[PDB]
Amino acid sequence: QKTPQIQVYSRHPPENGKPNILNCYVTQFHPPHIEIQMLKNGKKIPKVEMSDMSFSKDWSFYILAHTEFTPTETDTYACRVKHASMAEPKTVYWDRDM
Amino acid sequence: NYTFRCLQMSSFANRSWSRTDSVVWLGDLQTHRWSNDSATISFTKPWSQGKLSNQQWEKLQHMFQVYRVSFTRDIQELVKMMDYPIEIQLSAGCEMYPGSESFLHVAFQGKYVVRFWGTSWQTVPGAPSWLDLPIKVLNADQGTSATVQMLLNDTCPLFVRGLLEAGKSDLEKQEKPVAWLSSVPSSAHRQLVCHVSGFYPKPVWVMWMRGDQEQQGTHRGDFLPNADETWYLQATLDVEAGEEAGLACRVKHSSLGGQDIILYW
Ligand SMILES: *[C@@H]1O[C@H](CO)[C@@H](O[C@@H]2O[C@H](CO)[C@@H](O)[C@H](O)[C@H]2NC(C)=O)[C@H](O)[C@H]1NC(C)=O
Ligand SMILES: CCCCCCCCCCCCCCCC(=O)O
Ligand SMILES: *[C@@H]1O[C@H](CO)[C@@H](O)[C@H](O)[C@H]1NC(C)=O
């Protein structure tokens, strides 16, 4: 069993008030079964698109989740991952300072 | 210069549940997907057929359709004779050169165990010993061995050649990077971050600079994919408070026509 790594980054330079795209890239996990939610203020975002599951030279799986968002001075964005290698869902919050 | 990879992922949960999904990549550009619940292979590019005729494509896909159903039945029967859940992955394809080398690697429970090599299947150093029997019996399957050899020796390089011609304009697209700056505290001392996003192709140059002096301490992170087939990358630099003043991030990329991005902190 391999533990998922989560990296959350935006497509464009984040600018408060400006429609952007938030990427959640989950890598290094195994087996391939996984659950990925992207969150705004701790709530499930509905229209999250995902890439097809793929894997690397080391056989470990990866996938890209992404959704439309607007960075603001008050909203938190997060990527939460549920995977058999962890007893608890892991959440990583987007931080533009990165 | 180019790696073409077919990636098969097969999960076997119990006697009655399994699925197989595959994706195909030419460099960093997905060209196919084959969902378990799809009878047929899906093109993820306008040019994913390459130079193959419709007839050659149909034939080739039929062959894969037979292999998909066959493979499922073979593993399921194999476990019924000779411990769940089962994850099997296959990575086959070829590496092209300017004037190729083909591969078929198999992993089991995420451990590389078997390969095709020349004319037969081999178990790989420190694979499970029980794998030798089914692999020998499989080496007795002349028809499969012949098809596999053709696929790898002939079909792959030839098909990829067509792809390369057919996807010229996608493979050689230039998308310009956009860059921005941030910094981050430490337990002690700050860390400068240069965000570079939206560039294609992958190769890129990113350095923290003080005037014309390279800050060799520049640490390049992993290339993270965007959802539009462009790349994201940070280049970072530890600094002391005070030290930021005068530093700049410089990005060079083939898309920029020699006009480097320079961003001064
Ligand atoms: C596919 O290519 C492989 C090499 O990758 C061929 O296998 C070799 O064939 C030569 C020439 O007959 C033999 O001397 C070698 O012993 C074989 N190599 C290995 C590693 O076993 C294979 O014959 C080719 N098959 C087809 C159908 O073209
Ligand atoms: C089999 C090794 C090399 C493969 C050469 C195949 C030539 C065309 C590839 C088209 C993509 C087919 C994807 C099937 C992969 C799978 O589902 O296992
Ligand atoms: C995968 O495909 C076959 C036929 O489409 C089906 O019988 C099987 O149940 C599928 N697996 C899943 C998990 O649906």
Swiss-Prot record, chain A:
GO terms for biological process: amyloid fibril formation; antigen processing and presentation of endogenous peptide antigen via MHC class I; antigen processing and presentation of exogenous protein antigen via MHC class Ib, TAP-dependent; cellular defense response; cellular response to iron(III) ion; cellular response to nicotine; intracellular iron ion homeostasis; iron ion transport. Keywords: Disulfide bond, Immunity, Immunoglobulin domain, MHC I, Secreted, Signal. GO terms for cellular component: cytosol; external side of plasma membrane; extracellular space; Golgi apparatus; HFE-transferrin receptor complex; MHC class I peptide loading complex; MHC class I protein complex; phagocytic vesicle membrane. It is found in: Secreted. Changing A84V: In allele W2, W4 and W5. Residues 4-93 form the Ig-like C1-type domain. One of its GO terms (molecular function) is protein homodimerization activity. Disulfide bonds join C24-C79. Its main location: secreted. Heterodimer of an alpha chain and a beta chain. Beta-2-microglobulin is the beta-chain of major histocompatibility complex class I molecules. Forms a heterotrimer with MR1 and a metabolite antigen. Belongs to the beta-2-microglobulin family. Component of the class I major histocompatibility complex (MHC). Involved in the presentation of peptide antigens to the immune system. This is Beta-2-microglobulin. It comes from Mus musculus (Mouse). The gene is B2m.
Curated annotation (Swiss-Prot), chain B:
Antigen-presenting protein that binds self and non-self glycolipids and presents them to T-cell receptors on natural killer T-cells. It is a single-pass type I membrane protein. The gene is Cd1d1. N-glycosylated. The keyword Transmembrane applies. GO terms for molecular function: endogenous lipid antigen binding; T cell receptor binding. One of its GO terms (biological process) is regulation of immune response. One of its GO terms (cellular component) is endosome membrane. Keywords: Cell membrane, Disulfide bond, Endosome, Glycoprotein, Immunity, Immunoglobulin domain, Innate immunity, Lysosome, Membrane, Signal, Transmembrane, Transmembrane helix. It comes from the Eukaryota. Residues 177-265 form the Ig-like domain. Heterodimer with B2M (beta-2-microglobulin). Interacts with MHC II and CD74. Its main location: membrane. It is found in: Cell membrane; Endosome membrane; Lysosome membrane. During protein synthesis and maturation, CD1 family members bind endogenous lipids that are replaced by lipid or glycolipid antigens when the proteins are internalized and pass through endosomes, before trafficking back to the cell surface. Residues 1-265 are extracellular. Disulfide bonds join C94-C156, C194-C249. The lineage of its organism: Eukaryota, Metazoa, Chordata, Craniata, Vertebrata. Expressed on cortical thymocytes, on certain T-cell leukemias, and in various other tissues. This is Antigen-presenting glycoprotein CD1d1. The keyword Lyase does not apply. A D-galactosylceramide binds at D74, D141, Q142, G143, T144. Glycans are attached at N1, N14, N36, N153. It comes from Mus musculus.
